[PDB]
């Protein structure tokens, strides 16, 4: 099972949870104004029952609402923005779920093609992506959790198997969405 702890985001205007051993990256380096970034800082020695390893990273980003009324289409639009950064030309959803009609959607995504034509030129990365639409405040919250796969997990990935750690990351992602709370709406314009 997981044992995530509550954290305050954006000066306390928002709360959610992250796993123990995950550090707020802003304590060491400036991060974009609309983002909160947490990276796994666990030593290889310590081993929780989280199912997590030591290299995942979590990003919460407050973005403008995308002009797509459909929840899945909006989620896909935001996934595309994250993947296109990596040179990704085609991606696949290993898992997807409408958590709440019209407002919360989550999934696990993976690149299957890139602009250089070398899908397996380097290590595979699975990204958990959630969209929380705060329609009232014109903001699409996008939470992404990067999962750089080991050689074995990648072999599973393209044998249509879902690595155990990816299942654990999805449970963390859904819990972050489940415990997401806007405590102070004066954060938005």
Which structural domain range is residue 169 located in? 1-189
Q: Are strands 104-114 and 139-148 parallel, antiparallel or unpaired?
A: unpaired
Helical H segments across 54-157, by residue range: 71-83, 151-157
Experimental method: X-ray
Reference 108, options 130, 91, 93, 90; nearest CA is 93
Where do we find the tokens 């972050």? Answer: 176
Where do we find the tokens 């306390």? Answer: 12
Domains contained in the chain, number = 1
CATH number of residue 13's parent domain = 3.40.1000.10
Strand ranges of the sheet holding 57-64, from the earlier edge strand across to the other edge: 22-24, 35-40, 57-64, 139-148, 125-134, 104-114, 88-100
């Amino acid at each position: 099972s997981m044992n995530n702890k509550e954290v305050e985001l954006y000066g306390g205007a928002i709360t959610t949870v992250v796993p123990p051993g995950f550090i707020d990256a802003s304590t060491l380096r400036e991060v974009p104004d609309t983002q909160e970034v947490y990276v796994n800082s666990r030593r290889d020695e310590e081993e929780f029952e989280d199912g997590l390893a030591t290299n995942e990273s979590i990003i919460v980003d407050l973005l403008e609402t995308v002009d797509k009324s459909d929840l899945k289409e909006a989620w896909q639009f935001h996934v595309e923005d994250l993947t296109e950064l990596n040179g990704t030309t085609k991606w696949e959803a290993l898992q997807e779920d409408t958590v709440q009609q019209g407002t919360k959607f989550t999934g696990l995504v993976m690149e299957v093609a890139n602009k250089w034509g070398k899908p397996d030129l380097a290590q595979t990365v699975v990204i958990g992506v959630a969209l929380i639409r705060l329609t009232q405040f014109d903001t699409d919250v996008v939470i992404s959790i990067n999962v750089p796969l080991t050689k074995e997990e990648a072999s599973q990935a393209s044998n249509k198997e879902l690595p155990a750690r990816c299942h654990a990351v999805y449970q963390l992602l859904q819990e972050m969405v489940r415990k997401f709370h806007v405590v102070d709406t004066s954060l938005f314009a």
